[PDB]
Amino acid sequence: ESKPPYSYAQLIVQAISSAQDRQLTLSGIYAHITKHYPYYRTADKGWQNSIRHNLSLNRYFIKVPRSQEEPGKGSFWRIDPASEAKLVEQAFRKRRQRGVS
């Protein structure tokens, strides 16, 4: 339909996991995928608010600060550490649902 390979949860992983350390901002995860993904470039009237909503429902994603939002010289989203080797598993490969909840 549009983004069948990366999903608004694993797409973030390659976005944050493949990012400098492991954190991305709302407009960071976006500039990230369109950077390595040749699909996101002239169309974003959908996953835009999705990611923000996905970063919430996603189970292996969190914010860089303790818990309260606090923007400054550096403050964005981030993926869990012990969930990385797990999430990235879907970030290094395409969307698979053979056995991964």
UniProtKB/Swiss-Prot annotation:
Tissues expressing the protein: Expressed in tissues and cells in which the myoglobin gene is transcriptionally active including cardiac and skeletal myocytes, brain and kidney. In the adult brain, expressed in the piriform cortex and the indusium griseum. In the hippocampus, expression is localized to the dentate gyrus and CA3 area. In the cerebellum, expression is confined to the Purkinje cell layer. Present in neuroretinal cells: expressed in rod bipolar cells, amacrine cells and ganglion cells (at protein level).
Consequence of gene disruption: Mutants exhibit a growth deficiency and a severe impairment in skeletal muscle regeneration following injury. They show atrophic skeletal muscles and their satellite cell function is impaired. Double knockouts of CDKN1A and FOXK1 don't show significant differences compared to wild-type.
Organism: Mus musculus
Range within the parent protein: 289 to 389 of 719
Assembly information from the UniProt record: Interacts with SIN3A and SIN3B (via PAH2) to form a complex which represses transcription. Component of SIN3A-, but not SIN3B-, containing multiprotein complexes. Interacts with FOXO4 and MEF2C; both interactions inhibit FOXO4 and MEF2C transactivation activity. Interacts (when phosphorylated) with YWHAE/14-3-3-epsilon; promotes sequestration in the cytoplasm and leads to impaired ability to bind DNA. Interacts with FHL2. Interacts with SRF. Interacts with DVL2 and DVL3; the interaction induces DVL2 nuclear translocation. Interacts with BAP1 (when phosphorylated).
Protein name: Forkhead box protein K1
Outcome of substituting K45A: Decreases DNA-binding. No effect on transcriptional repression
Top-level taxon in the UniProt lineage: Eukaryota
Function: Transcriptional regulator involved in different processes such as glucose metabolism, aerobic glycolysis, muscle cell differentiation and autophagy. Recognizes and binds the forkhead DNA sequence motif (5'-GTAAACA-3') and can both act as a transcription activator or repressor, depending on the context. Together with FOXK2, acts as a key regulator of metabolic reprogramming towards aerobic glycolysis, a process in which glucose is converted to lactate in the presence of oxygen.
Transmembrane segments: none
PTM: Phosphorylation by GSK3 (GSK3A or GSK3B) promotes interaction with YWHAE/14-3-3-epsilon and retention in the cytoplasm. In response to mTORC1 signaling, phosphorylation by GSK3 is prevented, leading to translocation to the nucleus.
Protein localization: Nucleus; Cytoplasm
Residue ranges the UniProt entry marks as DNA-binding: 3-98
